[PDB]
Structure formats: C-alpha cells, structure tokens
Tab-separated table of C-alpha atoms and ligand atoms in Angstrom:
chain	number	residue	atom	x	y	z
N	1	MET	CA	18.647	2.735	17.544
N	2	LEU	CA	21.248	2.293	14.827
N	3	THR	CA	22.895	-1.142	15.581
N	4	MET	CA	21.279	-4.479	14.536
N	5	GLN	CA	21.265	-5.647	18.146
N	6	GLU	CA	19.191	-2.502	19.111
N	7	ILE	CA	16.896	-2.916	16.078
N	8	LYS	CA	16.174	-6.584	16.956
N	9	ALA	CA	15.524	-5.744	20.495
N	10	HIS	CA	13.043	-3.005	19.522
N	11	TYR	CA	11.117	-5.568	17.350
N	12	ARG	CA	11.776	-8.387	19.794
N	13	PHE	CA	13.312	-10.353	17.055
N	14	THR	CA	15.300	-13.244	18.541
N	15	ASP	CA	17.197	-16.384	17.629
N	16	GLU	CA	13.850	-18.243	17.629
N	17	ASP	CA	12.692	-15.820	14.890
N	18	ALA	CA	15.937	-16.350	12.899
N	19	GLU	CA	15.442	-20.181	13.283
N	20	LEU	CA	11.862	-19.947	11.985
N	21	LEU	CA	12.934	-17.890	8.908
N	22	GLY	CA	15.583	-20.556	8.200
N	23	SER	CA	12.871	-23.299	8.415
N	24	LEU	CA	10.962	-21.436	5.691
N	25	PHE	CA	13.969	-21.308	3.302
N	26	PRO	CA	12.866	-24.322	1.283
N	27	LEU	CA	9.405	-22.767	0.678
N	28	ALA	CA	10.796	-19.504	-0.215
N	29	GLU	CA	13.213	-21.073	-2.631
N	30	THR	CA	10.545	-23.262	-4.154
N	31	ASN	CA	8.487	-20.157	-4.774
N	32	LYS	CA	11.083	-17.609	-5.682
N	33	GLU	CA	10.209	-17.384	-9.272
N	34	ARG	CA	6.452	-17.215	-8.630
N	35	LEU	CA	7.326	-14.231	-6.239
N	36	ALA	CA	9.698	-12.623	-8.779
N	37	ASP	CA	6.917	-12.857	-11.587
N	38	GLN	CA	4.130	-11.508	-9.363
N	39	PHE	CA	6.340	-8.721	-8.021
N	40	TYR	CA	7.592	-7.746	-11.536
N	41	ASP	CA	4.178	-7.905	-13.134
N	42	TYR	CA	2.589	-5.708	-10.250
N	43	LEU	CA	5.246	-3.079	-10.980
N	44	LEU	CA	4.673	-3.178	-14.721
N	45	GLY	CA	0.962	-2.476	-13.851
N	46	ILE	CA	1.704	0.897	-12.345
N	47	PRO	CA	2.994	3.565	-14.988
N	48	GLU	CA	5.365	5.343	-12.473
N	49	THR	CA	7.227	2.198	-11.517
N	50	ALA	CA	6.840	0.687	-15.136
N	51	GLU	CA	9.205	3.487	-16.214
N	52	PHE	CA	12.101	2.096	-14.398
N	53	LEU	CA	11.688	-1.390	-15.962
N	54	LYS	CA	11.855	-0.206	-19.703
N	55	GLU	CA	15.663	-0.532	-19.947
N	56	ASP	CA	15.386	-3.745	-18.075
N	57	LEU	CA	13.267	-5.268	-20.911
N	58	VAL	CA	16.382	-5.961	-22.873
N	59	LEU	CA	18.944	-6.046	-20.200
N	60	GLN	CA	16.903	-8.606	-18.150
N	61	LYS	CA	18.479	-8.156	-14.690
N	62	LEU	CA	16.096	-6.585	-12.242
N	63	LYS	CA	13.706	-9.602	-11.918
N	64	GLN	CA	16.580	-11.669	-10.687
N	65	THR	CA	18.065	-8.877	-8.511
N	66	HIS	CA	14.747	-8.495	-6.402
N	67	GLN	CA	14.337	-12.405	-6.513
N	68	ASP	CA	17.680	-12.725	-4.826
N	69	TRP	CA	16.672	-10.123	-2.225
N	70	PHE	CA	13.622	-12.205	-1.425
N	71	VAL	CA	15.631	-15.333	-0.759
N	72	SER	CA	18.010	-13.420	1.500
N	73	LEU	CA	15.208	-12.678	3.829
N	74	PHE	CA	15.515	-16.424	4.880
N	75	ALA	CA	19.190	-16.827	4.620
N	76	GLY	CA	20.065	-16.234	8.297
N	77	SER	CA	22.870	-14.073	9.507
N	78	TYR	CA	20.870	-11.042	10.470
N	79	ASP	CA	23.862	-8.969	11.813
N	80	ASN	CA	25.504	-5.523	11.251
N	81	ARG	CA	26.632	-6.622	7.756
N	82	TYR	CA	23.025	-7.294	6.945
N	83	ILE	CA	21.903	-3.797	8.095
N	84	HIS	CA	24.788	-2.172	6.134
N	85	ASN	CA	23.642	-4.009	3.022
N	86	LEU	CA	20.063	-2.764	3.511
N	87	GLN	CA	21.268	0.852	3.927
N	88	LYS	CA	22.894	0.332	0.459
N	89	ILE	CA	19.752	-1.069	-1.077
N	90	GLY	CA	17.747	1.847	0.319
N	91	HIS	CA	20.239	4.318	-1.258
N	92	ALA	CA	20.353	2.671	-4.706
N	93	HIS	CA	16.590	3.568	-5.019
N	94	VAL	CA	17.045	7.132	-3.744
N	95	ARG	CA	19.997	7.437	-6.424
N	96	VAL	CA	17.675	6.235	-9.367
N	97	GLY	CA	14.909	8.679	-8.375
N	98	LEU	CA	12.298	6.165	-7.151
N	99	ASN	CA	9.855	7.669	-4.851
N	100	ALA	CA	9.872	6.047	-1.263
N	101	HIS	CA	6.074	5.411	-1.495
N	102	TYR	CA	6.746	2.665	-4.132
N	103	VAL	CA	9.021	0.918	-1.728
N	104	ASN	CA	6.130	0.696	0.789
N	105	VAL	CA	3.859	-0.443	-2.088
N	106	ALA	CA	6.266	-3.101	-3.222
N	107	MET	CA	6.654	-4.370	0.403
N	108	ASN	CA	2.906	-4.902	0.685
N	109	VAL	CA	3.131	-7.176	-2.453
N	110	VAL	CA	5.843	-9.196	-0.731
N	111	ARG	CA	4.043	-9.438	2.611
N	112	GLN	CA	0.770	-10.602	1.048
N	113	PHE	CA	2.540	-13.253	-1.061
N	114	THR	CA	4.624	-14.613	1.796
N	115	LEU	CA	1.768	-14.742	4.283
N	116	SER	CA	-0.255	-16.731	1.738
N	117	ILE	CA	2.586	-19.312	1.547
N	118	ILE	CA	2.322	-19.537	5.326
N	119	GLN	CA	-1.389	-20.025	5.421
N	120	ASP	CA	-1.298	-22.494	2.667
N	121	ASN	CA	1.506	-24.752	4.184
N	122	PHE	CA	0.993	-24.615	7.901
N	123	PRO	CA	-2.514	-25.910	9.124
N	124	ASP	CA	-1.313	-25.972	12.793
N	125	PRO	CA	-2.389	-22.537	14.288
N	126	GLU	CA	0.657	-21.854	16.682
N	127	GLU	CA	3.118	-23.019	13.854
N	128	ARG	CA	1.418	-20.576	11.540
N	129	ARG	CA	1.446	-17.744	14.151
N	130	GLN	CA	4.951	-18.073	14.890
N	131	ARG	CA	6.063	-18.223	11.303
N	132	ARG	CA	3.753	-15.176	10.386
N	133	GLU	CA	5.222	-13.218	13.342
N	134	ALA	CA	8.866	-13.940	12.217
N	135	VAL	CA	8.132	-12.979	8.538
N	136	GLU	CA	6.442	-9.765	9.608
N	137	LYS	CA	9.321	-8.658	11.744
N	138	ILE	CA	11.984	-9.275	9.041
N	139	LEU	CA	9.854	-7.491	6.322
N	140	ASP	CA	9.170	-4.528	8.734
N	141	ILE	CA	12.854	-4.388	9.694
N	142	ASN	CA	13.765	-4.150	5.965
N	143	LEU	CA	11.163	-1.533	5.171
N	144	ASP	CA	12.279	0.420	8.363
N	145	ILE	CA	15.983	0.457	7.184
N	146	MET	CA	15.260	1.232	3.623
N	147	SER	CA	12.900	4.050	4.653
N	148	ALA	CA	15.536	5.591	6.782
N	149	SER	CA	17.897	5.833	3.577
N	150	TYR	CA	15.587	8.521	2.207
N	151	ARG	CA	15.996	10.596	5.340
N	152	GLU	CA	19.655	9.972	6.189
R	1	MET	CA	0.852	14.203	-1.970
R	2	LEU	CA	-1.172	11.638	-3.858
R	3	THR	CA	-4.974	11.390	-3.703
R	4	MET	CA	-6.794	8.598	-1.790
R	5	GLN	CA	-7.798	7.199	-5.252
R	6	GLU	CA	-4.322	6.915	-6.489
R	7	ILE	CA	-2.983	5.321	-3.251
R	8	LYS	CA	-5.797	2.693	-3.309
R	9	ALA	CA	-4.926	1.936	-7.038
R	10	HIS	CA	-1.303	1.331	-6.098
R	11	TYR	CA	-2.190	-0.983	-3.095
R	12	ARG	CA	-5.002	-2.601	-5.032
R	13	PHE	CA	-7.321	-1.517	-2.362
R	14	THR	CA	-10.955	-1.873	-3.572
R	15	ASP	CA	-14.447	-1.253	-2.313
R	16	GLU	CA	-14.445	-4.824	-1.158
R	17	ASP	CA	-11.450	-4.218	1.107
R	18	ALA	CA	-13.321	-1.181	2.559
R	19	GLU	CA	-16.374	-3.278	3.268
R	20	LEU	CA	-14.276	-5.948	4.901
R	21	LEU	CA	-12.616	-3.336	7.082
R	22	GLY	CA	-16.015	-1.954	8.144
R	23	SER	CA	-17.239	-5.448	8.997
R	24	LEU	CA	-14.307	-5.818	11.538
R	25	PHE	CA	-15.407	-2.740	13.461
R	26	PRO	CA	-17.332	-4.718	16.192
R	27	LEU	CA	-14.440	-7.134	16.553
R	28	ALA	CA	-12.184	-4.117	16.950
R	29	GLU	CA	-14.431	-2.471	19.547
R	30	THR	CA	-14.317	-5.593	21.706
R	31	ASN	CA	-10.532	-5.754	21.579
R	32	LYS	CA	-9.589	-2.002	21.688
R	33	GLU	CA	-8.780	-1.846	25.417
R	34	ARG	CA	-6.424	-4.799	25.104
R	35	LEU	CA	-4.826	-3.221	22.157
R	36	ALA	CA	-4.484	0.079	24.004
R	37	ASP	CA	-2.833	-1.555	27.035
R	38	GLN	CA	-0.422	-3.694	24.972
R	39	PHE	CA	0.520	-0.814	22.673
R	40	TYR	CA	1.116	1.612	25.669
R	41	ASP	CA	3.114	-0.902	27.638
R	42	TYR	CA	5.292	-1.825	24.592
R	43	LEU	CA	6.289	1.881	24.375
R	44	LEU	CA	6.903	2.337	28.089
R	45	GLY	CA	9.321	-0.760	27.588
R	46	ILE	CA	11.641	0.884	25.333
R	47	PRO	CA	13.556	3.799	27.036
R	48	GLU	CA	13.649	6.082	23.998
R	49	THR	CA	9.844	5.957	23.408
R	50	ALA	CA	9.085	6.087	27.168
R	51	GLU	CA	10.670	9.569	27.219
R	52	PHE	CA	7.780	10.821	25.239
R	53	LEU	CA	5.241	9.484	27.663
R	54	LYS	CA	6.818	11.431	30.711
R	55	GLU	CA	4.034	14.337	30.515
R	56	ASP	CA	1.320	11.839	29.836
R	57	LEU	CA	1.913	9.905	33.169
R	58	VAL	CA	-1.179	10.837	35.284
R	59	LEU	CA	-4.231	10.826	32.876
R	60	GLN	CA	-2.831	8.731	29.972
R	61	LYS	CA	-4.619	10.835	27.455
R	62	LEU	CA	-2.139	9.293	24.852
R	63	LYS	CA	-3.351	5.774	25.572
R	64	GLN	CA	-6.801	6.868	24.487
R	65	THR	CA	-5.627	8.789	21.532
R	66	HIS	CA	-3.809	5.693	20.083
R	67	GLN	CA	-6.804	3.396	20.995
R	68	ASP	CA	-9.097	5.706	19.045
R	69	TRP	CA	-6.786	5.631	16.021
R	70	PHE	CA	-6.933	1.784	16.046
R	71	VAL	CA	-10.790	1.746	15.951
R	72	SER	CA	-10.782	4.384	13.119
R	73	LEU	CA	-8.915	1.792	10.846
R	74	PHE	CA	-12.352	0.007	10.577
R	75	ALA	CA	-14.638	2.992	9.584
R	76	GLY	CA	-15.306	1.427	6.153
R	77	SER	CA	-15.047	4.634	4.135
R	78	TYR	CA	-11.725	6.224	3.052
R	79	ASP	CA	-11.281	9.306	0.853
R	80	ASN	CA	-9.018	12.460	0.787
R	81	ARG	CA	-10.044	13.274	4.240
R	82	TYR	CA	-8.475	10.034	5.440
R	83	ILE	CA	-5.085	10.941	3.665
R	84	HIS	CA	-5.163	14.415	5.191
R	85	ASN	CA	-5.620	13.069	8.567
R	86	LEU	CA	-2.760	10.620	8.139
R	87	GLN	CA	-0.571	13.591	7.248
R	88	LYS	CA	-1.582	15.300	10.398
R	89	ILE	CA	-0.953	12.154	12.395
R	90	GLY	CA	2.564	11.806	10.953
R	91	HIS	CA	3.205	15.550	11.527
R	92	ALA	CA	2.396	15.195	15.129
R	93	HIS	CA	5.165	12.755	15.660
R	94	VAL	CA	7.693	14.829	13.647
R	95	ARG	CA	6.882	17.975	15.703
R	96	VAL	CA	7.439	16.222	19.131
R	97	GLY	CA	10.717	14.877	17.826
R	98	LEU	CA	10.041	11.128	17.630
R	99	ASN	CA	12.608	9.269	15.424
R	100	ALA	CA	10.509	7.760	12.485
R	101	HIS	CA	12.152	4.235	13.321
R	102	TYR	CA	9.760	4.036	16.303
R	103	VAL	CA	6.615	4.532	14.108
R	104	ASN	CA	7.849	1.443	12.039
R	105	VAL	CA	8.253	-0.502	15.425
R	106	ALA	CA	4.857	0.462	16.772
R	107	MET	CA	3.137	-0.321	13.469
R	108	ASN	CA	4.718	-3.967	13.677
R	109	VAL	CA	3.101	-4.189	17.190
R	110	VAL	CA	-0.274	-3.326	15.870
R	111	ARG	CA	0.025	-5.542	12.919
R	112	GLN	CA	0.813	-8.641	14.948
R	113	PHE	CA	-1.999	-7.868	17.308
R	114	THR	CA	-4.561	-7.390	14.530
R	115	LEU	CA	-3.424	-10.417	12.366
R	116	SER	CA	-3.945	-12.499	15.611
R	117	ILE	CA	-7.504	-11.198	16.000
R	118	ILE	CA	-8.001	-12.446	12.347
R	119	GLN	CA	-6.417	-15.937	12.917
R	120	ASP	CA	-8.214	-16.323	16.399
R	121	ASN	CA	-11.754	-15.369	15.002
R	122	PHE	CA	-11.906	-16.683	11.395
R	123	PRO	CA	-11.582	-20.528	10.997
R	124	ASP	CA	-12.473	-20.367	7.120
R	125	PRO	CA	-9.222	-19.953	5.144
R	126	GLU	CA	-10.606	-17.839	2.517
R	127	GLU	CA	-12.412	-15.452	5.074
R	128	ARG	CA	-9.202	-15.256	6.797
R	129	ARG	CA	-7.204	-14.546	3.713
R	130	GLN	CA	-9.418	-11.663	2.665
R	131	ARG	CA	-9.523	-10.044	6.002
R	132	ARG	CA	-5.731	-10.283	6.458
R	133	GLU	CA	-5.223	-8.901	2.871
R	134	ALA	CA	-7.425	-5.774	3.605
R	135	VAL	CA	-5.831	-5.244	7.141
R	136	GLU	CA	-2.321	-5.389	5.681
R	137	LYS	CA	-3.180	-2.852	3.002
R	138	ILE	CA	-4.686	-0.302	5.395
R	139	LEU	CA	-1.781	-0.740	7.935
R	140	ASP	CA	0.832	-0.369	5.047
R	141	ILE	CA	-1.084	2.745	3.734
R	142	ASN	CA	-0.987	4.296	7.332
R	143	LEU	CA	2.761	3.600	7.664
R	144	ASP	CA	3.333	4.914	4.067
R	145	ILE	CA	1.792	8.408	4.697
R	146	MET	CA	3.045	8.728	8.214
R	147	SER	CA	6.668	8.062	6.881
R	148	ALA	CA	6.186	10.795	4.231
R	149	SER	CA	5.692	13.420	6.894
R	150	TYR	CA	9.324	12.988	7.724
R	151	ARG	CA	10.341	14.104	4.167
R	152	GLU	CA	10.376	17.725	3.196
D	1	HEM	C1	10.402	-4.305	-1.197
D	1	HEM	C2	10.880	-3.236	-1.834
D	1	HEM	C3	12.242	-3.398	-2.588
D	1	HEM	C4	13.283	-3.925	-2.370
D	1	HEM	C5	13.727	-4.874	-1.043
D	1	HEM	C6	14.299	-3.856	-3.419
D	1	HEM	C7	15.594	-4.486	-3.475
D	1	HEM	C8	16.514	-4.063	-4.401
D	1	HEM	C9	17.860	-4.470	-4.436
D	1	HEM	C10	18.468	-5.578	-3.477
D	1	HEM	C11	18.542	-3.849	-5.252
D	1	HEM	C12	20.070	-3.993	-5.715
D	1	HEM	C13	20.660	-2.618	-5.069
D	1	HEM	C14	22.123	-2.687	-4.922
D	1	HEM	O1	22.685	-3.455	-4.125
D	1	HEM	O2	22.778	-1.974	-5.656
D	1	HEM	C15	17.556	-2.946	-6.032
D	1	HEM	C16	17.799	-2.139	-7.076
D	1	HEM	C17	16.849	-1.646	-7.889
D	1	HEM	N1	15.555	-1.642	-7.642
D	1	HEM	FE1	14.584	-2.372	-6.054
D	1	HEM	N2	13.596	-3.108	-4.419
D	1	HEM	C18	12.377	-2.749	-3.932
D	1	HEM	C19	11.507	-1.863	-4.673
D	1	HEM	C20	11.667	-1.464	-5.958
D	1	HEM	C21	10.654	-0.956	-6.826
D	1	HEM	C22	9.281	-0.629	-6.347
D	1	HEM	C23	11.168	-0.511	-7.943
D	1	HEM	C24	10.432	0.071	-9.009
D	1	HEM	C25	10.435	-0.384	-10.334
D	1	HEM	C26	12.563	-1.054	-7.845
D	1	HEM	C27	13.539	-0.808	-8.805
D	1	HEM	C28	14.919	-0.938	-8.657
D	1	HEM	C29	15.886	-0.340	-9.627
D	1	HEM	C30	15.629	0.441	-10.898
D	1	HEM	C31	17.218	-0.814	-9.115
D	1	HEM	C32	18.613	-0.565	-9.699
D	1	HEM	C33	19.053	0.871	-9.375
D	1	HEM	C34	20.317	1.103	-10.179
D	1	HEM	O3	20.162	1.021	-11.554
D	1	HEM	O4	21.463	1.378	-9.773
D	1	HEM	N3	12.767	-1.618	-6.695
D	1	HEM	N4	16.436	-3.243	-5.477
D	2	HEM	C1	1.560	2.909	14.595
D	2	HEM	C2	2.155	4.000	14.830
D	2	HEM	C3	1.454	5.152	15.535
D	2	HEM	C4	0.212	5.739	15.224
D	2	HEM	C5	-0.894	5.202	14.176
D	2	HEM	C6	-0.081	6.805	16.202
D	2	HEM	C7	-1.152	7.537	16.239
D	2	HEM	C8	-1.200	8.777	16.856
D	2	HEM	C9	-2.374	9.704	16.603
D	2	HEM	C10	-3.706	9.452	15.792
D	2	HEM	C11	-2.016	10.810	17.421
D	2	HEM	C12	-2.822	12.088	17.490
D	2	HEM	C13	-2.376	13.118	16.259
D	2	HEM	C14	-3.276	14.195	16.233
D	2	HEM	O1	-4.454	14.239	15.782
D	2	HEM	O2	-2.738	15.424	16.584
D	2	HEM	C15	-0.719	10.661	17.958
D	2	HEM	C16	-0.097	11.516	18.801
D	2	HEM	C17	1.070	11.277	19.479
D	2	HEM	N1	1.767	9.995	19.533
D	2	HEM	FE1	1.396	8.392	18.308
D	2	HEM	N2	1.069	6.972	16.904
D	2	HEM	C18	2.093	5.951	16.678
D	2	HEM	C19	3.129	5.798	17.264
D	2	HEM	C20	3.710	6.455	18.332
D	2	HEM	C21	4.938	6.113	19.073
D	2	HEM	C22	5.895	4.947	18.657
D	2	HEM	C23	5.091	7.038	20.012
D	2	HEM	C24	6.116	6.965	21.104
D	2	HEM	C25	5.773	7.241	22.283
D	2	HEM	C26	3.949	7.945	20.015
D	2	HEM	C27	3.668	9.030	20.805
D	2	HEM	C28	2.796	10.021	20.389
D	2	HEM	C29	2.834	11.336	21.039
D	2	HEM	C30	3.911	11.925	22.117
D	2	HEM	C31	1.733	12.136	20.627
D	2	HEM	C32	1.340	13.566	20.880
D	2	HEM	C33	2.128	14.589	20.053
D	2	HEM	C34	1.631	15.904	20.456
D	2	HEM	O3	2.119	16.455	21.553
D	2	HEM	O4	0.788	16.443	19.795
D	2	HEM	N3	3.102	7.571	18.859
D	2	HEM	N4	-0.357	9.334	17.711
C-alpha cells in the first residue's frame, strides 16, 4: 500500500498518465492565477475556512502556496519524494486545525476547474478521455495521501 | 457530523444538481450490470482487496450490494437520511478492517466509469458540463463522509 509504486499500481497510473499530465503543463500554467483566484475566493465564501485566511489578508502568501501545489500536479516525477511531500502537506493542515472535510471540499473545486480546462481545449473525444482519466488519478492520489495524514 | 444542508452548501450542491442526478437514473439502470462487473473485477485484481471477497465467492451478494449503491447515487433527493446512510456505509468498511486507501481507489474506478457514461451519451458541451459537475459533487460527498468514518 504505502510505496508510490504500489499506489500507482492500485490506481493503474502509468508512464502514459505521467506523459499526459506533462502535456497539460502549459494549460495549467496559463490558468494558474485563475485557479488560485477561484480556489481562494471559494474558501473566503465559507466562514469556517475563511477563518484561516484572516492573517493571510496582510501576509499574502497562501494564494501563492496553493497555486504552486496546483502547478506541481503537472510537473512530472511522481515518485517516493512526491508521496513524502504530500504526507507533509497533509500534516500541515492537521497541525493548524483544519477539518479534513474541507480538504475534500477544496479538492472538488480543483477537480471541476481542471476538467473544465480539458473540456474547453480538447474537442477530440479520446484525447479528452485520456487527459481526464490522468487528471482524475493524480487528484485522487493527492486526496488519498492527504486523507491518510489525518489517520496516521 | 454536519447536516446534509451544510454539506450541500460547502460543495455548492443545489436543487438543480439533485434534479440532474435524478435525470441520470435510467442511464444508470442500463449500465448497472457493466458497472457491477467492472467494479468487482477490479477488487478481485488487487490481492489486498480480494482477501475481503473470500467469503463472498459463491453467491456474490457483495457484487449486488455495490451495484445497488451505484444506482442510489441517482435517487434525485438527498437529506439527512442520505448522510446517515453514508456513515453506515463507511462504518461497514471500518468494521471488516478494510484500509481506507482502498475506498479512495474504488471511488476513482466508479468516477472514471461514470464520467465515461456522461461523455459517451451527451454530445452537447453544456449538458455534459452540468452533468459532470453534479456527478463529481455526489461522488466527492460520498467519499468525504465514508472517509470520516475512519476518524474517532
Ligand atoms: C486540495 C486541497 C488542498 C491542498 C492540495 C493544499 C495544499 C497546501 C500546501 C502544499 C501547503 C504548504 C504546506 C507545507 O508544505 O508546509 C498548504 C498549507 C496550508 N493550507 Fe492548504 N491545501 C488544501 C486545502 C486547504 C484548505 C481548504 C484550506 C483552508 C483555508 C487550506 C489552508 C492552508 C493553511 C492555513 C496552510 C498553512 C499551514 C501553516 O500555517 O503552517 N488548505 N496547503
Ligand atoms: C466507492 C467505494 C465503496 C462504496 C461506495 C461501497 C459501498 C458499500 C455498501 C453500500 C455496502 C453495504 C453497507 C451496509 O449497508 O451495511 C458495502 C459493504 C461492503 N463492502 Fe463496500 N463499498 C466501497 C468500497 C469497497 C471496497 C474497496 C471493498 C474491498 C473489497 C469493499 C468491500 C465491502 C465489504 C467486504 C462489505 C461488507 C462488510 C460487512 O461484512 O458488513 N467495498 N460497501
């Protein structure tokens, strides 16, 4: 279960999926600020998550921190270093007192945004299917490892 | 645990999403045996999950149990009874001893299958978008509540 190789096998994530995520890097990068604004504004709309963004109003760091994570989904090198880093990300949220429910909530926001980029840029059905399948795997892997930080 | 109303607000799940899911019920009904076979075969194909299907071998009651859950996604009405039932579903996996990682894996299988039904049956880009968005919300809400069952 615990190694990256094992996790990839369970999700049937292969080098083809990694190549497809790399092929989406330019679109993700083009759209990174739109993603960051929509992500940040959605959180500002829920009082419970809005709390965590009060100090950030002045510090002005957290929009960039989550923007950078989004870009990393497409950066390649999905290896044991990548999983270790996700475990760290998960624990950061546990440490500040964020309920895991809001991680699931946030991940829905990213998922809808990214699938809309795919729908809007890939008219060919099988190109679209393959890119959607790769993105759903990486988002689900991210959510899986982060969720496990609340248990472990 | 949160109320259905609060969960819907966090996921921006509206009466329109509930109506779209209800409208997918006949489509679900005509794909349910294909879903049930693919879901059960995927679990047989990982040794860790296949261990939990040993007792089920002869009559495959669990294949039906999982099929029935899939069709229930498309009931078109969702209130506190639906959240309570998801807690019961999560708890059933906790009590048999299944690591929650495999619930995330299985939800990716169902997600990919269901989004292919949407792509394969809805040529109109906006009809597709709206149905995909409703499906991703209800799957993410199921995953969210089931995950919560593993936290004291
Ligand atoms: C898709 C879900 C999420 C992902 C992938 C994510 C990603 C990250 C990353 C990469 C970091 C930097 C952690 C580190 O390396 O130290 C971080 C920190 C942080 N995130 Fe998130 N995040 C998510 C959801 C949320 C939500 C919903 C909130 C609520 C407002 C939030 C608030 C925070 C805060 C407050 C920190 C800094 C913790 C500290 O002060 O040490 N995150 N997040
Ligand atoms: C999308 C993820 C899954 C969903 C939505 C789901 C759904 C369900 C439902 C609705 C039940 C009946 C619960 C009840 O009313 O008592 C159940 C039971 C069960 N499921 Fe799943 N399931 C999922 C993943 C899995 C996985 C990955 C396995 C691994 C083999 C599994 C094995 C079982 C077993 C063994 C039971 C019976 C537990 C008992 O003895 O009561 N399920 N599931």
